[PDB]
Amino acid sequence: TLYIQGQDEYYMARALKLAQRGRFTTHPNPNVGCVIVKDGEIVGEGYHQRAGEPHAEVHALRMAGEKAKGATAYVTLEPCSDALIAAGVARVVASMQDPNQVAGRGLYRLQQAGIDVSHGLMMSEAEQLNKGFLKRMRTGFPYIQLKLGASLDGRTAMASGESQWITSPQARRDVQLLRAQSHAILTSSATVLADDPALTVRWSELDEQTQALYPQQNLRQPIRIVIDSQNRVTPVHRIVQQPGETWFARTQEDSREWPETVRTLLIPEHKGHLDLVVLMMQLGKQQINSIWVEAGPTLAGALLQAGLVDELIVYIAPKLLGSDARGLCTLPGLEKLADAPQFKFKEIRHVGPDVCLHLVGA
Amino acid sequence: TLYIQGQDEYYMARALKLAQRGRFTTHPNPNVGCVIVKDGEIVGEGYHQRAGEPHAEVHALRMAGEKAKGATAYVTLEPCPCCDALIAAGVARVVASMQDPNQVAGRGLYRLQQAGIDVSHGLMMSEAEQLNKGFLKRMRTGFPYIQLKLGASLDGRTAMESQWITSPQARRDVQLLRAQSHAILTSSATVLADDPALTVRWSELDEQTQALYPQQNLRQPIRIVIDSQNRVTPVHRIVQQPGETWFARTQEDSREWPETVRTLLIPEHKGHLDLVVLMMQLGKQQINSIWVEAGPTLAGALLQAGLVDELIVYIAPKLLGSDARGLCTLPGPQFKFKEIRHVGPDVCLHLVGA
Numbered sequence: 135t136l137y138i139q140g141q142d143e144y145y146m147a148r149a150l151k152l153a154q155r156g157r158f159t160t161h162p163n164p165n166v167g168c169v170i171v172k173d174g175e176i177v178g179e180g181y182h183q184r185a186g187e188p189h190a191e192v193h194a195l196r197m198a199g200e201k202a203k204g205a206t207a208y209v210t211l212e213p214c215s216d217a218l219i220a221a222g223v224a225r226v227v228a229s230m231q232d233p234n235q236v237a238g239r240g241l242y243r244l245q246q247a248g249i250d251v252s253h254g255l256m257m258s259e260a261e262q263l264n265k266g267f268l269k270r271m272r273t274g275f276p277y278i279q280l281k282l283g284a285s286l287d288g289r290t291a292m293a294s295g296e297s298q299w300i301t302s303p304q305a306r307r308d309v310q311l312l313r314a315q316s317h318a319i320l321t322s323s324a325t326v327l328a329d330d331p332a333l334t335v336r337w338s339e340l341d342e343q344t345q346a347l348y349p350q351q352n353l354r355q356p357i358r359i360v361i362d363s364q365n366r367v368t369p370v371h372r373i374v375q376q377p378g379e380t381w382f383a384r385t386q387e388d389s390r391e392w393p394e395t396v397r398t399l400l401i402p403e404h405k406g407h408l409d410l411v412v413l414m415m416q417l418g419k420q421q422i423n424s425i426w427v428e429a430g431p432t433l434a435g436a437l438l439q440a441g442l443v444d445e446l447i448v449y450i451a452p453k454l455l456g457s458d459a460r461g462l463c464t465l466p467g468l469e470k471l472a473d474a475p476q477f478k479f480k481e482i483r484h485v486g487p488d489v490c491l492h493l494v495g496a
Numbered sequence: 497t498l499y500i501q502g503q504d505e506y507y508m509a510r511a512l513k514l515a516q517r518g519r520f521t522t523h524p525n526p527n528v529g530c531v532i533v534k535d536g537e538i539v540g541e542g543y544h545q546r547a548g549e550p551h552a553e554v555h556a557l558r559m560a561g562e563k564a565k566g567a568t569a570y571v572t573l574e575p576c577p578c579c580d581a582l583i584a585a586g587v588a589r590v591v592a593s594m595q596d597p598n599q600v601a602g603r604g605l606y607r608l609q610q611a612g613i614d615v616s617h618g619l620m621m622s623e624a625e626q627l628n629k630g631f632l633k634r635m636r637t638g639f640p641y642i643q644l645k646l647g648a649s650l651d652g653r654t655a656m657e658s659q660w661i662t663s664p665q666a667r668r669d670v671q672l673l674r675a676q677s678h679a680i681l682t683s684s685a686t687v688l689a690d691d692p693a694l695t696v697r698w699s700e701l702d703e704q705t706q707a708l709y710p711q712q713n714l715r716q717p718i719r720i721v722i723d724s725q726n727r728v729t730p731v732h733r734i735v736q737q738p739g740e741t742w743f744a745r746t747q748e749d750s751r752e753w754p755e756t757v758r759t760l761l762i763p764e765h766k767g768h769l770d771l772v773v774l775m776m777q778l779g780k781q782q783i784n785s786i787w788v789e790a791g792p793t794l795a796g797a798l799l800q801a802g803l804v805d806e807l808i809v810y811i812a813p814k815l816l817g818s819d820a821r822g823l824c825t826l827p828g829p830q831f832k833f834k835e836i837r838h839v840g841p842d843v844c845l846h847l848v849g850a
């Protein structure tokens with residue numbers, strides 16, 4: 135009665151924890167956790183590491199071997215569309231049913247062979263495990279995190295230079311970790327021209343996330359997405375010569391030679407500007423789960439007005455900035471924002487000498 | 497010692513908790529708490545309520561009467577005439593959290609030691625220190641402790657005027673912070689534009705309501721308004737509230753004002769009213785702590801003058817473009833974070849000088 139329903143919450147939670155372990159390497163695939171239990175003991179465990187790699191269930195099955203037969207297989211996301219049939223499990227508990235609403239019902243496919251199925255357990259948590267992916271699936275759009283670095287009174291970088299203010303070493307290290315689980319990193323050409331950044335993940339800037347999993351060589355570099363209407367960023371720029379891909383969102387094709395890692399996407403304009411909504415969506419088709427935006431004032435405002443921001447992370451430095459510095463703060467152009475997907479605070483924490491304010495449209 | 501030390505820490509903590517109790521009514525006097533222990537048991541407690549009323553030690557001593565003979569007194573501040581009370585009561589051992597801020601007057605402990613009383617100081621001073629930031633700073637430097645408050649949207653645009661765009665619970669919070677500050681400083685422009693009352697409304701408190709501060713004990717913080725030119729009128733709401741209002745003037749106003757209005761004459765400095773001298777003058781006037789409700793211009797002035805001890809920043813989850821822009825001026829003092837906390841849908845970030 136209560137014994138089975140209370141013991142489920144132990145093992146499901148264990149499956150969620152394992153799923154979390156692939157969050158850095160898993161794109162465009164979702165995070166899935168699997169735990170197989172036989173009268174009181176975990177006979178098999180597994181989670182999804184990479185896109186080419188085996189699924190979580192496959193891993194746990196290989197581990198469990200013949201011990202899989204008896205009882206319960208705790209999963210995070212409905213399987214299939216196989217193994218658990220031949221494996222011989224009775225009972226599989228899936229945390230959530232699967233987004234894609236058409237062909238997304240092969241949960242019953244297991245009960246077809248008399249398995250005691252069941253879903254919905256700790257779904258709240260399993261949803262939060264795959265925000266990006268689940269949003270790309272349900273809606274057309276990737277999940278967007280806008281990062282801002284401002285001073286006490288809004289304002290950034292002391293000058294207009296569309297460069298991003300990187301508030302502290304601690305703030306940089308914090309962002310690295312947030313970058314590392316993001317599918318892609320987005321920026322504007324104006325930032326690349328002003329900062330010449332690498333926008334990669336340096337492994338050495340991660341903590342005990344370093345061990346828990348994500349060993350050195352497994353390091354996955356998020357896709358680098360750059361907006362420039364005009365093709366102002368030059369192939370000599372640091373960003374394109376980093377390991378991994380870097381995709382330019384161009385108003386028209388470039389004429390030059392770019393390293394093999396570079397790709398281009400063609401995006402129509404909208405009122406003299408490259409259309410961000412079409413872009414976002416085109417990145418959708420491209421299987422992009424989640425974007426981390428390192429933006430100047432202009433880009434950040436455009437995203438907010440275009441209603442494309444899911445959550446914004448604000449790093450505040452303990453400075454008040456001089457006469458009239460830039461920053462999204464107190465600057466004309468942004469008219470109908472008070473009247474557009476407004477946000478609410480989720481978390482606030484110290485980051486070295488800075489504070490980080492998490493908000494989300496909710 | 498180990499038990500005695502832990503035992504001391506308990507009683508001092510209590511004396512600190514008691515001192516806090518009069519933090520709303522105590523100005524310009526410090527908050528002070530006293531616990532008197534007679535082999536194991538608290539035989540007298542007291543704290544300071546009001547400038548006119550008795551000291552914490554006296555209150556406690558009257559509750560202890562005869563029981564004070566034997567042993568220990570835990571005081572929040574070096575005591576004191578108020579030093580003859582303890583000797584007369586016949587206590588062995590007193591423990592003060594910190595010595596007198598004034599380093600001319602520090603020998604209050606020597607006085608008791610002479611009567612053969614076992615003295616000691618230092619215990620939980622960090623906390624005593626925090627209990628009286630302003631009074632302590634006024635004794636130390638010539639100056640009051642300035643708390644600058646700012647209210648803004650995410651994009652720093654000015655979003656805090658009681659139909660505030662910020663929030664209810666934020667107003668409730670601000671009211672609490674006003675209620676325990678000695679004075680509220682503002683500028684004419686704020687007074688002219690908003691016509692505020694700059695008072696504490698007892699109805700906007702909470703369990704502080706009980707904590708102490710009954711309705712009639714309500715002490716209205718001193719209202720201080722800057723106007724070089726004498727723009728504010730006797731008919732503005734600010735001057736008709738219960739309590740005093742003080743105009744920082746550059747030259748004497750000629751009008752008839754209520755008995756509760758004073759004016760302080762302040763010299764100029766490069767064609768503006770010299771803020772530093774104002775602060776000094778208020779210091780001499782015994783103002784412990786100024787809670788600033790100003791607009792951008794004044795906020796920038798105080799900052800550039802190096803006069804801001806801490807700042808309390810309220811942010812609302814709004815973003816703006818509603819020609820209500822601004823927050824700070826700064827025709828060019830830098831901070832470090834202390835506490836950050838939620839206040840309903842808003843956050844409030846406390847920062848201090850360094």
Ligand SMILES: O=P(O)(O)OC[C@H]1O[C@@H](O)[C@H](O)[C@@H]1O
Nearest residue numbers: 657686690692693694695789
């Ligand atoms: O009228 P009360 O509620 O005292 O205060 C009005 C407020 O509105 C503004 O003018 C000031 O910043 C002040 O804090």
